[PDB]
Amino acid sequence: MDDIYKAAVEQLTEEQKNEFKAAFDIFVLGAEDGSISTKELGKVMRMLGQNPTPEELQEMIDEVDEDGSGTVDFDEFLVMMVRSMKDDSKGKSEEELSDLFRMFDKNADGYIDLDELKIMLQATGETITEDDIEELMKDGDKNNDGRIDYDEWLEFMKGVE
């Protein structure tokens, strides 16, 4: 099966894309792997806008780099454009977040305290100090009432690895 990404690269005349390949051709000019940067692995992963854990990053290479390079080569360079238009598309969705607080409710009411959140980070094995949660909750709850309702939930998931 073909894709709109690889379809464009094959459609771009060698002479046409050559004019755009003069940009990356500069960096790679002094490279042996053919990539633009040796540690570009962390940069290419940013193009997707998702870096929850360093363990999952290794999976990204197998999600986009079927070859196993970890960098945007001459071929990927052309796709880097059509791939940069992936905006307006994240991992979590309002549809999930809705069932998230609902499914993660031991009392099933609509509010999620600070403890209810710990169970989430606990699943990974991590652990913070009482000073982190105390200050953290202050953010999750714009009203700092005591729990995280629907509206509050949407905010609590505004930014936090």
Side-chain angles (χ1 to χ4, degrees), residues 105-134:
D105 207 328
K106 58 207 149 92
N107 326 274
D109 32 42
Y111 339 111
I112 316 298
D113 312 86
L114 77 87
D115 193 76
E116 282 177 81
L117 332 180
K118 262 77 267 170
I119 299 111
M120 189 185 119
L121 83 97
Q122 280 275 86
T124 74
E126 225 56 66
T127 180
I128 37 176
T129 47
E130 286 181 38
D131 195 74
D132 259 85
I133 297 92
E134 273 225 308

Side-chain angles (χ1 to χ4, degrees), residues 9 37 45 52 61 67-68 95 101 105 110 115 125 127 148 156 158:
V9 177
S37 268
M45 87 98 63
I61 299 96
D67 46 275
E95 272 290 314
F101 74 77
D105 207 328
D115 193 76
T127 180
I148 299 302
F156 176 43
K158 64 89 105 262

Side-chain angles (χ1 to χ4, degrees), residues 75-93:
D75 197 82
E76 275 146 66
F77 137 79
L78 283 180
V79 185
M80 247 296 101
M81 212 79 190
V82 296
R83 187 144 225 160
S84 149
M85 63 145 191
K86 87 304 177 170
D87 209 64
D88 302 308
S89 324
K90 271 204 168 78
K92 308 293 284 190
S93 283

